Amino acid sequence: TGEPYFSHPLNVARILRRAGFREEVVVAGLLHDAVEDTEMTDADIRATFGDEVADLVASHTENKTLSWEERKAHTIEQVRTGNLEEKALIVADKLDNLTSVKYALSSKSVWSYFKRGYDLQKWYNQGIKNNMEYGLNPSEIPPFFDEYARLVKWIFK
Amino acid sequence: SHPLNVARILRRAGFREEVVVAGLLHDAVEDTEMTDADIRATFGDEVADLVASHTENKTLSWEERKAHTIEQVRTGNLEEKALIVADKLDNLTSVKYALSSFKRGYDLQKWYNQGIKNNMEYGLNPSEIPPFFDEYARLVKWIFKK
Ligand code: NA
């Protein structure tokens, strides 16, 4: 994970803050990796940060007992049907991830880069890109959604 | 949500985001005993270093822990001082509202908060003191006037 904070949670929080999202949303973005990558749980988040943040976090957390294809399909459905905040949490997370991917590829064959393989990564990112605007009014789509779309088009053309 | 209020305090005062995040994470880190390695791998070295500056040794008595915090706010850098004071400001903000509409007792809370207030400015130039340090001093004075 690259600039400016050299930390995925800090960079995702910045994308959300700059897009105008309230503090509860920014913090939910910050805590995503804490829940998925450490022993911290949903109950720990509720006890310390409250139910609103805990619920925002839970909206994008993967159930790790499911296969990659199933976890990913569930995220696509959530980016389609969630509210603006829920959609933003998912897109911001993917945007920082693809930013690091573009950086790696700019030095590294896209057909050999992904451990889950190109086809699956393409299917996934195109799925987020093609569903993130569903049900949103043009005036509320965050500018960073366009940055993610451009990255998907660049990496998976 | 107290952590969010601590974040708001630090951000408004102009501190960099690593300090803001370290403030936000203080309770979570103590309530779950998250290791340095976990904080460091998840949030980065800058956040991890700041979080480590304000973590109490649970084996010592409450008074020993607090006395140590009082000495830390005296000798720490500006960011370390700010983390401690923001935490206490948030706490007292709640107490003041409840009192208008104490853990371990009044005498101990008074001793602790007066200690922070009386040592937070040590080693700083008047122009460096965040205005929220003054908000905190006023709360200590109003709450512990008896
Ligand atoms: Na977890």
Query: Ligand 1: distance of its center to the CA of B123 in Å?
Result: 41
Instruction: Give how far Cα B15 sits from Cα of A136, B9, B10, B12, B21, Å.
Output: 35, 9, 6, 8, 10
For A22, the 3-state DSSP assignment is coil
Chain B: residue whose CA lies nearest to A45: B28
**Contact flag A5-B44 (C-beta cutoff 8 Å):** yes
Sorted by where each begins, the domain ranges of chain A are: 1-157
CA distance A10 to B100: 37
Experimental method: X-ray
Which residue bears the tokens 């649970």? B58
**Contact flag B44-A14 (C-beta cutoff 8 Å):** no
Query: Ligand 1: distance of its center to the CA of B42 in Å?
Result: 12
**Contact flag B44-A10 (C-beta cutoff 8 Å):** yes
CA distance B22 to B17: 8
Closest CA to B142 of B105, B100, B104, B85: B100
Closest CA to A90 of A128, A49, A137: A128
To one decimal place, what's the resolution in Å?
1.9
Which residue bears the tokens 């084996």? B59
Q: Write out the catalytic residue numbers of A.
A: 36-37
Four-residue CA torsion sign, A8, A13, A19, A24: positive
Closest CA to A34 of B4, B23, B28, B18: B28
CA distance B16 to A115: 36
Radius of gyration of chain A (CA): 15
CA distance A80 to A57: 17
- Nearest 5°: the CA angle B25, A46, A55 is 110
